[PDB]
Amino acid sequence: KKRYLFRSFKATKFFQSTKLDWVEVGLQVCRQGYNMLNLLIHRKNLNYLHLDYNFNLKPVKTLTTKERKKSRFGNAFHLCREVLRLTKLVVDSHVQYRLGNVDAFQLADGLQYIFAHVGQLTGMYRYKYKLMRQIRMCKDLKHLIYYRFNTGPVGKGPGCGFWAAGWRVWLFFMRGITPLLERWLGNLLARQFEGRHSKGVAKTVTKQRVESHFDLELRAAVMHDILDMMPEGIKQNKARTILQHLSEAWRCWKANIPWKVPGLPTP
Amino acid sequence: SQLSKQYSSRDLPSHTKIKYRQTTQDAPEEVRNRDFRRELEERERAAAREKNFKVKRRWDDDVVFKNCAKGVDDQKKDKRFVNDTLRSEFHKKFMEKYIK
Amino acid sequence: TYNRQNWEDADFPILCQTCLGENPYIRMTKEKYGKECKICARPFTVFRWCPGVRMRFKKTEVCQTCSKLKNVCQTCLLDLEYGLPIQVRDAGLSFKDDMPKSDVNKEYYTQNMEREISNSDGTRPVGMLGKATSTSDMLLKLARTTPYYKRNRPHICSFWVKGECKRGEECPYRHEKPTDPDDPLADQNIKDRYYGINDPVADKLLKRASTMPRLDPPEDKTITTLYVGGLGDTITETDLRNHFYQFGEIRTITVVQRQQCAFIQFATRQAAEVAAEKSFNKLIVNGRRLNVKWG
Amino acid sequence: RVALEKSVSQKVAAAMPVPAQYIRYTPSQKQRVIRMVEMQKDPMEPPRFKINKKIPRGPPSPPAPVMHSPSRKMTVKEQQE
RNA sequence: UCGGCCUCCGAACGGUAAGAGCCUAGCAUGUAGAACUGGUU
RNA sequence: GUGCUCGCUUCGGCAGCACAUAUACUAAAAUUGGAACGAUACAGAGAAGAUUAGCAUGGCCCCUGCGCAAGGAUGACACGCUCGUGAAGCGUU
Numbered sequence A: 001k002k003r004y005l006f007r008s009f010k011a012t013k014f015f016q017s018t019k020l021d022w023v024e025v026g027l028q029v030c031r032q033g034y035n036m037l038n039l040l041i042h043r044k045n046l047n048y049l050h051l052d053y054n055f056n057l058k059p060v061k062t063l064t065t066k067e068r069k070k071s072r073f074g075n076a077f078h079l080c081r082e083v084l085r086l087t088k089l090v091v092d093s094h095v096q097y098r099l100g101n102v103d104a105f106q107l108a109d110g111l112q113y114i115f116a117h118v119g120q121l122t123g124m125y126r127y128k129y130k131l132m133r134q135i136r137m138c139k140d141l142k143h144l145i146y147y148r149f150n151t152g153p154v155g156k157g158p159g160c161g162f163w164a165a166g167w168r169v170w171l172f173f174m175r176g177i178t179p180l181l182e183r184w185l186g187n188l189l190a191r192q193f194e195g196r197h198s199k200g201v202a203k204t205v206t207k208q209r210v211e212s213h214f215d216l217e218l219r220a221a222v223m224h225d226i227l228d229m230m231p232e233g234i235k236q237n238k239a240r241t242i243l244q245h246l247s248e249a250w251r252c253w254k255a256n257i258p259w260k261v262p263g264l265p266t267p
Numbered sequence B: 001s002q003l004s005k006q007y008s009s010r011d012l013p014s015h016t017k018i019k020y021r022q023t024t025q026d027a028p029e030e031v032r033n034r035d036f037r038r039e040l041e042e043r044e045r046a047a048a049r050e051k052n053f054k055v056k057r058r059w060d061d062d063v064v065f066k067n068c069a070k071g072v073d074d075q076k077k078d079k080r081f082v083n084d085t086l087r088s089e090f091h092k093k094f095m096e097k098y099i100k
Numbered sequence C: 001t002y003n004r005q006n007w008e009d010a011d012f013p014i015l016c017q018t019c020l021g022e023n024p025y026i027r028m029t030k031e032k033y034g035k036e037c038k039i040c041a042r043p044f045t046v047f048r049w050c051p052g053v054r055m056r057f058k059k060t061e062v063c064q065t066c067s068k069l070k071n072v073c074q075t076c077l078l079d080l081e082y083g084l085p086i087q088v089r090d091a092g093l094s095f096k097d098d099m100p101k102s103d104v105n106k107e108y109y110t111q112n113m114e115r116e117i118s119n120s121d122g123t124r125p126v127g128m129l130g131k132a133t134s135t136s137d138m139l140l141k142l143a144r145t146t147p148y149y150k151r152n153r154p155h156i157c158s159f160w161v162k163g164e165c166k167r168g169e170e171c172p173y174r175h176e177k178p179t180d181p182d183d184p185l186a187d188q189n190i191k192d193r194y195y196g197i198n199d200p201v202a203d204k205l206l207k208r209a210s211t212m213p214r215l216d217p218p219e220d221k222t223i224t225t226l227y228v229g230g231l232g233d234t235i236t237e238t239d240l241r242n243h244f245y246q247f248g249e250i251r252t253i254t255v256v257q258r259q260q261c262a263f264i265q266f267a268t269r270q271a272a273e274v275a276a277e278k279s280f281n282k283l284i285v286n287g288r289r290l291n292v293k294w295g
Numbered sequence D: 001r002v003a004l005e006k007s008v009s010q011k012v013a014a015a016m017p018v019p020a021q022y023i024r025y026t027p028s029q030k031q032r033v034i035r036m037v038e039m040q041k042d043p044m045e046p047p048r049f050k051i052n053k054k055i056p057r058g059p060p061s062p063p064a065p066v067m068h069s070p071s072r073k074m075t076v077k078e079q080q081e
Numbered sequence E: 001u002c003g004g005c006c007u008c009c010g011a012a013c014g015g016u017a018a019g020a021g022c023c024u025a026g027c028a029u030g031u032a033g034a035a036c037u038g039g040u041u
Numbered sequence F: 001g002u003g004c005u006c007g008c009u010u011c012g013g014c015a016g017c018a019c020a021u022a023u024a025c026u027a028a029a030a031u032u033g034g035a036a037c038g039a040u041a042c043a044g045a046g047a048a049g050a051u052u053a054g055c056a057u058g059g060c061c062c063c064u065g066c067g068c069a070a071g072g073a074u075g076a077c078a079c080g081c082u083c084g085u086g087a088a089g090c091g092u093u
C-alpha cells in the first residue's frame, strides 16, 4: 500500500503549505533541531549540559557521579545530533555562498569535501558503525573522481568539487536510516513521556543468566513434586528442608562424598 | 497493554503469510481418507527386510609372554548404551583423550 | 506487576440540563484520551461544547466512572436528579459511603468499582441508589426548578480587572467586577466538592434549609388539633379526610371558611404529627395550599 | 474466527506505528440533537500521561465451592512415616 | 626475446558508592463552583 | 459585498432577486501544585578473619539505555518457626 505521509499531514489542520527559498528552509530545519534538542535536555533537567550551535554536547561544570550517570545519552540522541551537525555543515556552506564570502567553485569544492570527509568532520561512526561501509564507498568515489580529474595540465590542487556521487551515497543512507531513527526516537519520546515500565516485558534467558535460572527451574520442579507426593493430612510440609537435602546431595555428588541420610522416606 | 507507544525491534511485522500444506504435503483432506495401519505394516516389513651345523630358534621364540592380545575384540561392545554419564563409553573416551 | 487502571473510553456524556444549554441542536466535540480525570486521575474521553450563545465552552472534568459512581454531572459536579451538591444529598440520605484519599488506594478502589460496574448492567449508581428510594425529606424544598444559566457565564477578564483589556467589547470574557476574595465561599476545592467535605456552598444551603421549619409543627400542648390555613372554601373536609386516611384513623376533620382553616386531629400522636408535617406548607388539595400551625 | 480476526485487527491497529454523526439525546429530566464530531489528532504530538502506575492486583472472582471426597485422616504411624 | 591479484581502520558500559530531607530551580493547570426573605382557636 | 431588474424612476439612492451561512483548549492573563538534586548537614560500600568476581529470585522501589541487550555497590530493599493448661464434640461406666 502506498500510504503517503505528507498528504496525510496536509489533510489535517495542523499543517500548512507555502513556497520558500531552500536556504531559508535549511536554516529553519537547523534552528528547529537545535531548539528541540535543547528542549529535550531541559525536559530531562540536565541544565549542567549545553548544546553548542554546531551540535557539540558539552558539560558546563565538573560532574558528580549522579550527574554522570543521569547525563549519559544513547545512540539515538547522538546519531540525530550528528545528522543535524552534517546538515548544519551543508546549509552553512550554502549560507556562506549566499553572503558572497566564498565563490561557487569554492562552494562545490566544499560540498565535495564534506561528502568525502563526513567521517573526519563528524563523529557519526561511533554510534552506528555500519556507516564505515558508506564512508569507504565515499573514499573510493573520491579516488575515482580525482583520477579522472587530475589528468592533463591540472595538478594535485584542492580545486575539484564534483559532489554528486557522495551526495547520492548519503541520501541512500538517509533512506535506510530514516525508519530506524524514527522508531528509536519514538521509543525515546515514549519513555520520556509515558515513563519506563519497570518489569513490563519479561527478560529473556541470555547466556549470563543460564545457570542460575536452570537451578531456579529445578527448584520449582522439585517443589511441585513435593506438593503432590505428600498424602492427606501432614501440616508440616517442610519443603525447605527437602530443598536443603537436595542441595546437600548435589554438593556431596560434586565432591564424590557418600551421601546417605539415615532416616529419610523412600519416595 | 496497547496504550503504550513503545515498539520493540522484534515486534515488527514479519512472516505475515501462513504457509499451508499442499497436496503432496499431507493436506487433511487426503489424511482423512487414508488407512495408516496397512501402510505401517509394509513400512515395518520393508524395514525388517532392509535390516538384514648349528640350528637356531625362531626369532620371536625367546620372549617371556605370548598371545596376550587373544581375547581383545570390541565388535558390538561399542554399540552398548549406558545411562550413566561417568561410566559411558563416550565419557571414557573423552577422559582418555583430554587428560594426559 | 500487571495491575493498572484501565482507560475509560465511551461516548454519550452524562450531563445536567443546565450545563447542556437550551438549544436542541448542539455541535459537539470529542477527544478519545484528551485529559485526565480530576478525581481518579485516569485518562478519559473528553467532551467539549458551547452550551449557548455567550457561554464559556464548558467541557467534562471528571471521568464517567466517578460520575456514574456518585450520580453527578461530569462538569457541574451536582446531582442529576436534584441539582444539589453531593454533601447536601449525603447529609439528606447517607454519609457512611466514603472514599479513600491516598492515590494508590483511590486508584485501587476506582478500579474495583469500575470492574464491578462493568460486571453489572452498565448504568447503575451502585446500591446507593437503593438507599436513595426515600426522598422529599427537605431537599425538594430548596431544589431549583429553572435552569440556572448564570453558571455558564464566561470568566472575568483579568486584563479588565487591571484595566488593560485592549479588546474592549471584542473580549469574550466578562468586563465586570469579581466577587469578594475575603469571602470564604470563594475557596471551592474540587476534591472537597466531590467528597462532600467542608464545602461552603453546602454549608450555606444547609443553614438556609435549617431555617425553614417546613416539618417542625408541634405548637400545641399535647393537642392533636392543628389548623391548616390557606384552604378556604376551595378545599373541603373530603380532601382532609382523604389526606388523613393515609395516616390511619382521624379523630376529627373539619373545614371552616370563616377563618379559612382546616382543623385536623388524629387519635394517634404519630399520625397527627405526620399529618401536621405533610400539611406544613407542602400540601395542595383541590387547588388550595395548606400551611399547618396551631389552632 | 470472525471475532478473533476482529480482535487481531484491533490489536495490530493499536500496535501499528504511525465523519460527523448525529445522535438523539433524552436527558430524562425536550429531546436534543447532538452532532458527534471527533477532533483531529495531532500527529506531531507525544503521549500525554504517565502509564507506568503500578497498583496491587485486585480481588479475583468469588471462589468456587470445593467438592471433595471425605478426608482420610492419617494415623500416627503414618505421621512418623 | 611473454602479467595483472594489496584485509585492517571506533565508540558506550565496564571505577571514581548508595540513601536522606530541608528553602531553592525547572515543569504541569489556564480548571468545576458562588442558590441566600411570606399562612387563621 | 458583487451582479442584474419588463422596477421606483432619478440618474444619487431605494426595493426585489441571485451568490456568499457559523472561527477559537475562546488570554496579551489571574490563579493553582508540584518539584532537578546541587550547597551544607545527617550519612557510610553483601557473603560468620581480611580483600573481593558475580548471576538470580519477589514487587504500590526506580534510574541510564532504541532495547525481549547490558549497566546502575551482585542497582537498592527484602529472616525465625518438640509438652502441659482449659473449652467443645464423640463412645463406656
Ligand SMILES: O=P(O)(O)O[C@H]1[C@@H](OP(=O)(O)O)[C@@H](OP(=O)(O)O)[C@@H](OP(=O)(O)O)[C@@H](OP(=O)(O)O)[C@H]1OP(=O)(O)O
Residues within 6 Å of the ligand: A116, A139, A146, A156, A157, A158
Ligand atoms: O585525506 P586527504 O588529506 O584529504 O587527501 C586526499 C587523499 O587521501 P586518501 O587517499 O587517504 O583518501 C590523497 O592524499 P594522499 O593519501 O595521497 O596523501 C589524495 O592525494 P593524491 O591523489 O595526489 O594521491 C588527495 O590529495 P590531493 O588534493 O593533493 O590530490 C586528497 O586530498 P583532498 O581530499 O584534500 O583533496
Ligand SMILES: [Mg+2]
Residues within 6 Å of the ligand: none
Ligand atoms: Mg567477610
Ligand SMILES: [Mg+2]
Residues within 6 Å of the ligand: none
Ligand atoms: Mg556483569
Ligand SMILES: [Mg+2]
Residues within 6 Å of the ligand: none
Ligand atoms: Mg544487573
Ligand SMILES: [Mg+2]
Residues within 6 Å of the ligand: none
Ligand atoms: Mg560493577
Ligand SMILES: [Mg+2]
Residues within 6 Å of the ligand: none
Ligand atoms: Mg563487586
Ligand SMILES: [Mg+2]
Residues within 6 Å of the ligand: F074
Ligand atoms: Mg540485583
Ligand SMILES: [Zn+2]
Residues within 6 Å of the ligand: C015, C016, C017, C018, C019, C020, C073, C074, C075, C076, C077, C078
Ligand atoms: Zn452539569
Ligand SMILES: [Zn+2]
Residues within 6 Å of the ligand: C037, C038, C039, C040, C041, C042, C062, C063, C064, C065, C066, C067
Ligand atoms: Zn474518575
Ligand SMILES: [Zn+2]
Residues within 6 Å of the ligand: C157, C158, C159, C160, C165, C167, C168, C171, C172, C173, C174, C175
Ligand atoms: Zn476583557
